[PDB]
């Protein structure tokens, strides 16, 4: 089935490393102390 062949084909470059911006994690307004 052609659908099966499409399912078998790989998806190049489609991983989180290339797809989303590489930046630091935002700080937060912690006040529990």
């Amino acid at each position: 089935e052609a659908d099966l062949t499409d399912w078998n084909l790989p998806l190049a470059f489609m991983k989180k490393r290339h797809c989303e911006k590489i930046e630091g994690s935002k700080s937060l307004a912690q006040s529990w102390r």
């Binding site: 052609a2 084909l9 190049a12 470059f13």
Partner: protein, 442 residues
Amino acid sequence: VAMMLAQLVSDGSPMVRKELVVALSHLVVQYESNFCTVALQFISVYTQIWRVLLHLAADPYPEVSDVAMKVLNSIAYKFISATVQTGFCDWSARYFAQPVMKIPEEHDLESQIRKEREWRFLRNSRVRRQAQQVIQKGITRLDDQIFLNRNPGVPSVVKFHPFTPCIAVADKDSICFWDWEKGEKLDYFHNGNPRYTRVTAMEYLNGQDCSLLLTATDDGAIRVWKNFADLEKNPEMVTAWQGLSAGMVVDWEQETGLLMSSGDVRIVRIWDTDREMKVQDIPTGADSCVTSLSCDSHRSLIVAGLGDGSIRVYDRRMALSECRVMTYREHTAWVVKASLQKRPDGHIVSVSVNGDVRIFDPRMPESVNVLQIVKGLTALDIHPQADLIACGSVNQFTAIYNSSGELINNIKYAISCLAFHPHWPHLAVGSNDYYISVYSVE
């Protein structure tokens, strides 16, 4: 320890390259005097370190190049004049904030992701399926011209959108998207490469779903782009790197999921997108450079044409000494074109300046058949799964025949590029006059 930096320049991973630049900065901050002296002299570990710094400055990827530009100022003008940092570790640490004890919605068998993927695959399957019915009901003829329009700049290369009635026409540095069903433009983009460079080839990637675009630059570079189809979105780069010195020739294997590259050298190199590291490097074996190259899906046969008129077939499984397996020497001049068919029985089609279109089988050392259209060709095209071959002429004559030579269509237009449509019989022709046209079924 310092000798390790030069080895990782060959990796395609842009993040590794940026971190490598950061490591260069951290190493040079302590021994700046030698690099300052060398740079002032230029206006052997340190010499090669400076050379790889130069290479990283010439990185097509904007971020590594920018970091290199900022870093260089700390040496030439010498106090720490430049400061650098990147957030790889924090982005990685972001991992533990997300849920860990739940199945992602993407793996649910009723989410919209699965539905959209299945529907797109159904569209692709329907497009593929209708081709057999169209072709096998009696050879269809392309008498109906559907699209014909002009654009600024000579059309260097044209490619069909595999599952959408539109084409991408690219030149030295820019791309335009035109829908031949509408006859209207879709979008415009600039590759970004400078005057001293040109685009040697264009290709599509991931045509089954969320297709991307690829460009090869004669500087030995490769670039990838996405979001070039939507009218409401700007295209974005995916990956970019220079790994090699006809200029640059690139082939892709979606089924095998591997990129292969060569050029005006005796070398062929293979890359895997997932690992971002070169997988294999095969010397040409012969003493002549390569002009064109095409290979098979999941099979070891690699077919290449050389500048001495010989055609080589390699078995990439074995060692380099045993790599070569099959040689053809019939044409006298350089190989104008050579291609391998992925049909159930392997076949090879080649043509040279001699004007002899020759068809060979892998298990024989001589051409199975010979035909001629005219001595010297500007465009040659072969249908993937049909008995169809299209050939243009410098005399404004073009035609489509069977592989047996029987004529099917004759046309008079100066043809620069000419190509088929993989599934639904169509023919796209762009002339040296900036004019691009398409012919469709009946």
